[PDB]
Design a protein around this ligand. Structure first.
Ligand code: 2LC
Length: 209
């Protein structure tokens, strides 16, 4: 079954701001997603020091960037800690509510959209370039789930029947028609070099067939 949920008012407001505000510096979405992947990788690495069996679902700690011109998607894959069903529906959304309030207050005071990561809501910067975001995730303590939202105040959660991941997260960005530059190899390399050159995990930019 597919379960549909309403975003909390603050989150729906943040999504509308990201989608409707005129802001040309859209490239910052990639550093935000890579930062979340890096944080998830730090988490599983730290937990594995006390419990080595937490790496039975995969020892490799990496980030893959996969462009697909045919599907018009940019996928950010990590072998991080992943997210449980409770993380997807409640936990992260609860943390995001206070972060959103602080961010929108900072914007009113003169801060810009690029500072979004300091408020812990950098994931939502994906809506600067994507019309729809699909999140496939697998945490050691739960099943593989698919979260999805095209904004409009709702998101869906379902058990995923695609290729099993072992552990980690895939953020699938269904790009807006005018944002296809983020599928270009030299554009992605430029963005990674500018904003994500010191990430402590291998970042592999896949090339198109
Ligand atoms: C806030 C927030 C961060 N991430 C998010 C989104 C992500 F894709 C990741 C990731 N692991 O790649 C990630 N990692 C952190 C939690 C576990 O380790 C750090 C967080 C999400 C949110 C949401 O509100 C919606 C969501 C639950 C669909 C996604």
């Amino acid at each position: 079954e597919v379960e549909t949920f309403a975003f909390q008012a603050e989150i729906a407001q943040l999504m509308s701001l990201i989608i409707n505000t005129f802001y040309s510096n859209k490239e910052i979405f990639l550093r935000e997603l890579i930062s979340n992947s890096s944080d998830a990788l730090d988490k599983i690495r730290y937990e594995s020091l006390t419990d080595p069996s937490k790496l039975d679902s995969g020892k490799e700690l990496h980030i893959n960037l996969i462009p697909n011109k045919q599907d018009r998607t940019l996928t950010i894959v990590d072998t991080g800690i992943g997210m449980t069903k409770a993380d997807l529906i409640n936990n992260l959304g609860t943390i995001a509510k206070s972060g959103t309030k602080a961010f929108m207050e900072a914007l009113q005071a003169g801060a810009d959209i690029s500072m979004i990561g300091q408020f812990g809501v950098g994931f939502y910067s994906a809506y600067l370039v994507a019309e729809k975001v699909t999140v496939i995730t697998k945490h050691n303590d739960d099943e593989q789930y698919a979260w999805e939202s095209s904004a409009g105040g709702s998101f869906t959660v379902r058990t995923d029947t695609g290729e099993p991941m072992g552990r980690g997260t895939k953020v699938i960005l269904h790009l807006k028609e005018d944002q296809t530059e983020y599928l270009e190899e030299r554009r992605i390399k430029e963005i990674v070099k500018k904003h994500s050159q010191f990430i402590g995990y291998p970042i592999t930019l896949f090339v198109e067939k």
